[PDB]
Amino acid sequence: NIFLVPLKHLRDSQFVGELLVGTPPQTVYPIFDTGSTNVWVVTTACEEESCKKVRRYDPNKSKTFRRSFIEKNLHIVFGSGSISGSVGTDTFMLGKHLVRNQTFGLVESESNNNKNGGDNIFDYISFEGIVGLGFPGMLSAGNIPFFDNLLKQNPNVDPQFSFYISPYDGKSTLIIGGISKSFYEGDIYMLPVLKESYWEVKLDELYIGKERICCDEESYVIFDTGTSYNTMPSSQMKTFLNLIHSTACTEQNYKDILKSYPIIKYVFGELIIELHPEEYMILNDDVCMPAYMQIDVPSERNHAYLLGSLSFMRNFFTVFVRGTESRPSMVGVARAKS
Numbered sequence: 488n489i490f491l492v493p494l495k496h497l498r499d500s501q502f503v504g505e506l507l508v509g510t511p512p513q514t515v516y517p518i519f520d521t522g523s524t525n526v527w528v529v530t531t532a533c534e535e536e537s538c539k540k541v542r543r544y545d546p547n548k549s550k551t552f553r554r555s556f557i558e559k560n561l562h563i564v565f566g567s568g569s570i571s572g573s574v575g576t577d578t579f580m581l582g583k584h585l586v587r588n589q590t591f592g593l594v595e596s597e598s599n600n601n602k603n604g605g606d607n608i609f610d611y612i613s614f615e616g617i618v619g620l621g622f623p624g625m626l627s628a629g630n631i632p633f634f635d636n637l638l639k640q641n642p643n644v645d646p647q648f649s650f651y652i653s654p655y656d657g658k659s660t661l662i663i664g665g666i667s668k669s670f671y672e673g674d675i676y677m678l679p680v681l682k683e684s685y686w687e688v689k690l691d692e693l694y695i696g697k698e699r700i701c702c703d704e705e706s707y708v709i710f711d712t713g714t715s716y717n718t719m720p721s722s723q724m725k726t727f728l729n730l731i732h733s734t735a736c737t738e739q740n741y742k743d744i745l746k747s748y749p750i751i752k753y754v755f756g757e758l759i760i761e762l763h764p765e766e767y768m769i770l771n772d773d774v775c776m777p778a779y780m781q782i783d784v785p786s787e788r789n790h791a792y793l794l795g796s797l798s799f800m801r802n803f804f805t806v807f808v809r810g811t812e813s814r815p816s817m818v819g820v821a822r823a824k825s
């Protein structure tokens with residue numbers, strides 16, 4: 488049995504889907520993140536302005552909510568903001584499928600702890616939560632992650648999911664347990680996941696046009712729906728900004744200005760995945776920018792390259808296959824439909 492969960496592309500970068508929590512059920516619209524594993528829900532215990540503007544789950548109105556003991560609020564700090572809150576368990580429902588006794592994080596503050604003077608991601612978006620879809624290694628608290636708990640309680644669902652991203656129409660969809668040829672064109676190329684925390688596969692080479700920028704050290708590609716942009720390590724970013732400059736542009740001449748920009752080629756052994764200038768240049772205000780940011784995923788000697796939603800999944804249908812005993816963990820990539 489296979490089912491799907493449609494996603495609404497919001498005015499911010501978000502692709503949110505319907506999620507029901509508690510008894511009687513309350514409705515929240517979280518994003519679905521392959522770059523984290525916790526489940527976060529914005530609650531009424533967060534009285535901040537960036538919280539009060541959205542639908543807030545109230546645990547006091549849930550007969551099935553249970554409070555978990557913690558010594559301190561768990562604090563998650565990342566690039567553009569911070570999430571902080573407590574933890575409990577409740578019963579969830581996603582696409583009419585039931586997940587009971589699921590541990591999740593209750594957002595109680597969105598204060599930015601990188602630089603507390605402004606620049607907070609939650610001021611610019613209508614954030615209601617995160618459904619983590621990564622591997623159990625990244626679970627911060629609780630007995631079992633959300634997706635695994637869904638499968639344990641729905642054993643006729645196959646441990647896999649996939650994302651069709653099309654921001655222009657309303658056909659953006661998350662499908663759980665399978666795929667559909669109604670989304671991709673051609674074949675699906677499989678890449679083994681070698682690091683079961685993120686959805687992380689090995690990257691062999693990376694070209695910006697004809698210039699080879701990777702790899703001389705061990706490099707990896709992370710498929711992360713929870714970022715709009717693609718990323719590169721700091722070292723390659725100085726090179727990237729010298730080969731791909733941002734320029735002024737308009738909606739009228741952008742095809743003309745990007746005629747000279749290079750093709751970005753991601754090489755996975757035999758598979759070559761190309762990014763054309765109109766597929767990685769973002770247009771905001773009157774500036775054509777590369778849809779790339781600088782992220783150094785922490786590790787001793789590994790380098791991680793992230794593939795985001797706006798720049799990658801919009802053009803490439805992506806399948807995530809959880810490993811079992813009859814198969815390993817892989818990600819599948821195919822061209823998307825028009």
Ligand SMILES: CCC1(CC)CC(=O)N([C@@H]2CCOc3ccc(C(=O)N[C@H]4CC(C)(C)Oc5ccccc54)cc32)C(=N)N1
Pocket residue numbers: 499500501502518520521522523563565566567570608612614617711712713714715782
């Ligand atoms: C969701 C954040 C976390 C989980 C706590 C942590 C985390 O840092 N990342 C990545 C990997 C590292 O680099 C970055 C850098 C930036 C961003 C970012 O600002 N993302 C935006 C996208 C948008 C506006 C559509 O929705 C939301 C909704 C909430 C928060 C952020 C966003 C994400 C990541 C996750 N993949 N997941």
Ligand SMILES: *[C@@H]1O[C@H](CO)[C@@H](O)[C@H](O)[C@H]1NC(C)=O
Pocket residue numbers: 555576588590629630
């Ligand atoms: C729910 O999960 C908790 C772990 O947080 C566990 O102690 C409990 O036995 C589980 N089942 C029920 C019915 O609470």
